[PDB]
């Protein structure tokens, strides 16, 4: 499923991401745009055998188990397939754990490079939330 910007903003708001760990809602929408282009089925294989899954491109080396990654730790205690669902619940709950790891949203490369320090509120403007 490919979310619309405001459709995702609304869903993320319902999931309680607004100001989660101090990150306003726009940060999350912006992160999803650059990580997966709002695509819940996005996947990216890495040179270390791991794979990034879902709308927030969560890595199988640490957060979810896809049973094909060397040195996996499944800290979110979920199968990576749950991160490919049209229902973002699993991605959101894991993202909440990741952003609470100790280094904020910096864990998302796309967020660091295209969202951090920008006017992220722009990402929820017009959404009538």
């Amino acid at each position, epitope marked *: 499923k490919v979310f619309g910007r405001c459709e995702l903003a609304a869903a993320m708001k319902r999931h309680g991401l607004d100001n989660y760990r101090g990150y306003s809602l726009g940060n999350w929408v912006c992160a999803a745009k650059f990580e997966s282009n709002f695509n819940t089925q996005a996947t990216n294989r*890495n040179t*270390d055998g*791991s794979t990034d899954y879902g709308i927030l491109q969560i*890595n199988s*080396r*640490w957060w979810c188990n896809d049973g094909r990654t060397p*040195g996996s*730790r499944n*800290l979110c205690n979920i199968p990576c397939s749950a991160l490919l669902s049209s229902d973002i619940t699993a991605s959101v709950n894991c993202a909440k754990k*990741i952003v609470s*790891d*100790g*280094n*904020g949203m*910096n*864990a998302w*490369v796309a967020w*660091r*490079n295209r969202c951090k320090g920008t006017d992220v509120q722009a990402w929820i403007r017009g959404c009538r939330l």
Partner: nanobody
Amino acid sequence: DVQLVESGGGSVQAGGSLRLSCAASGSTDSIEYMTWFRQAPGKAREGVAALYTHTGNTYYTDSVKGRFTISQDKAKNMAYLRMDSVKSEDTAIYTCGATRKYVPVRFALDQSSYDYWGQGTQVTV
């Protein structure tokens, strides 16, 4: 990829200080963690101090807390290990490690969490 070069190793008397440098080449802000590991003679390699470059947060193994300080110069892809008040137990080959992927903090001092390594520098107390 990332190349890691260490420098600053050598002899130091117990109680003295030494500063190690780790210079990375092959990327800049894609590097996530820059970390120092060490391997004492006849022992297994252990994480000593880790630094997450995008926040400057640091993580230390208990035996060096308060004595060693890891810092960086993000612009130059440099990581430094200031070893203050060294002890005989600190004798070892110090090696720099790095990753271009996020690593949960709880595993930031584990060697298996790193994808790039320097060649090591000897420190003798």
